[PDB]
Design an enzyme around this catalytic site. Structure first.
Site, PDB file in Angstrom:
ATOM      1  N   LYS A  89       0.824  -1.203   0.000  1.00 26.45           N
ATOM      2  CA  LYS A  89       0.000   0.000   0.000  1.00 26.45           C
ATOM      3  C   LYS A  89       0.861   1.258   0.000  1.00 26.45           C
ATOM      4  O   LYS A  89       0.309   2.350   0.020  1.00 26.45           O
ATOM      5  CB  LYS A  89      -0.940   0.006   1.207  1.00 26.45           C
ATOM      6  CG  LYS A  89      -1.762  -1.262   1.360  1.00 26.45           C
ATOM      7  CD  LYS A  89      -2.962  -1.259   0.427  1.00 26.45           C
ATOM      8  CE  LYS A  89      -2.620  -1.884  -0.914  1.00 26.45           C
ATOM      9  NZ  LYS A  89      -3.788  -1.884  -1.839  1.00 26.45           N
TER      10      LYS A  89
ATOM     11  N   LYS B 145      15.274  -4.753   5.535  1.00 28.19           N
ATOM     12  CA  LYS B 145      15.503  -3.659   6.422  1.00 28.19           C
ATOM     13  C   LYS B 145      16.922  -3.491   6.967  1.00 28.19           C
ATOM     14  O   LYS B 145      17.490  -2.434   6.816  1.00 28.19           O
ATOM     15  CB  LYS B 145      14.419  -3.352   7.399  1.00 28.19           C
ATOM     16  CG  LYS B 145      13.063  -3.093   6.874  1.00 28.19           C
ATOM     17  CD  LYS B 145      12.034  -2.986   7.947  1.00 28.19           C
ATOM     18  CE  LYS B 145      10.724  -2.483   7.437  1.00 28.19           C
ATOM     19  NZ  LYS B 145       9.715  -2.436   8.466  1.00 28.19           N
TER      20      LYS B 145
ATOM     21  N   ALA C 244      10.567  -5.995  14.304  1.00 34.01           N
ATOM     22  CA  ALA C 244       9.482  -5.039  14.431  1.00 34.01           C
ATOM     23  C   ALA C 244       9.577  -4.304  15.773  1.00 34.01           C
ATOM     24  O   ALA C 244       9.565  -3.100  15.804  1.00 34.01           O
ATOM     25  CB  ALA C 244       8.129  -5.708  14.264  1.00 34.01           C
TER      26      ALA C 244
ATOM     27  N   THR D 226      10.821 -16.388  22.627  1.00 37.62           N
ATOM     28  CA  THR D 226      12.214 -16.758  22.847  1.00 37.62           C
ATOM     29  C   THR D 226      12.844 -15.794  23.828  1.00 37.62           C
ATOM     30  O   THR D 226      13.114 -14.630  23.467  1.00 37.62           O
ATOM     31  CB  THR D 226      12.976 -16.706  21.516  1.00 37.62           C
ATOM     32  OG1 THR D 226      12.355 -17.614  20.595  1.00 37.62           O
ATOM     33  CG2 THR D 226      14.391 -17.247  21.695  1.00 37.62           C
TER      34      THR D 226
END
Ligand SMILES: Nc1ncnc2c1ncn2[C@@H]1O[C@H](COP(=O)(O)OP(=O)(O)O)[C@@H](O)[C@@H]1OP(=O)(O)O
EC number: 1.1.1.25
Length: 265
Positions: free
Chosen positions: A15, A65, A130, A151
């Protein structure tokens, strides 16, 4: 015609172009924003060629990223802490500058929702990239954070990494302190004790299920939780911040968000 893009794989679902077009329109900036499929191996070469051929900047989404961050010549504190970057700007002097607007986008959207009061007690589920990309601005917004992940080692690393910037406690997923959390943020792809969820006052999923409830929201709703939001606003706000970095004009976040939601619904 100035060129920007979003790089990712996959990218067909993005988007970003729709959002950035509306952001450009609203600010009367003359530019174009396209979607680019980053090759899993050749991404670095493709990206650099993209800038050599004159692009002004781009967003980066999965799975690049980290990789984009490593390519940059200069970077912001936000990008440094995240060790990842969702925004690159080719500066006038030729330098590739990385920033990460994910965190400030999240902050901006929570502010829209009036879910970011100073000194809130916030539970964050997940300790992947994130979360790593949003901790700094959340901490800077005086959020006191309890971090939990499937984790544990990753939880501890992040708490250790961000400890200098505010209050963040790492806890095992099976010992999340039982308390009322003003806000619970899902930053998993992904198993929280439902007794914890039930006490929570507001629930935010960084995930955005185009046209439906994400698993996390569905879960919250099944426990009778109602004060919930997905992360579409975060997606629009990070874009607005990237736009501001590129353009030197801050788009009206709320308006474009509203139009997109209207576009959306
Ligand atoms: N089934 C599951 N249950 C709980 N957490 C899960 C999950 N699947 C993915 N995740 C989580 O989601 C996070 C990673 O999500 P992701 O696939 O979107 O990557 P990233 O956060 O880097 O974008 C991790 O916190 C986390 O689990 P682990 O660190 O233990 O691998």
């Amino acid at each position: 015609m100035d060129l920007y893009a979003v790089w990712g794989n996959p990218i067909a679902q993005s988007k970003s172009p729709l959002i950035q077009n509306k952001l450009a329109a609203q600010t009367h900036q003359t530019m174009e924003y396209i979607a680019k499929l980053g090759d899993l191996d050749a991404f670095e070469q493709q990206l650099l060629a993209f800038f050599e051929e004159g692009a002004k900047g781009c967003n980066i989404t999965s799975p690049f990223k980290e990789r984009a961050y490593q390519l940059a010549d200069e970077y912001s504190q936000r990008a440094k802490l995240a060790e990842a970057c969702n925004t690159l700007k080719k500066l006038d002097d030729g330098k590739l500058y990385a920033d990460n607007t994910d965190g400030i986008g999240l902050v901006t959207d929570l502010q829209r929702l009036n879910w970011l009061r100073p000194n809130q007690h916030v539970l964050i589920l997940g300790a992947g990239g994130a979360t790593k990309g949003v901790l700094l601005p959340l901490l800077q917004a005086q959020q006191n954070i309890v971090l939990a992940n499937r984790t544990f080692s990753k939880t501890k690393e992040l708490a250790e990494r961000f400890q200098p910037y505010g209050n963040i406690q790492a806890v095992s997923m099976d010992s999340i302190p039982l308390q009322t959390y003003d806000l619970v943020i899902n930053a998993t792809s992904a198993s929280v004790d439902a007794e914890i969820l039930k006490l929570g006052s507001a629930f935010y999923d960084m995930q955005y299920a185009k046209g439906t409830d994400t698993p996390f929201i569905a879960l919250c709703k099944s426990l009778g939780l109602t004060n919930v939001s997905d992360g579409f606003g975060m997606l629009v706000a990070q874009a607005a911040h990237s736009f501001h970095l590129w353009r030197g004009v801050m788009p009206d976040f709320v308006s474009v968000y509203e139009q997109l939601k209207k576009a959306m619904l």
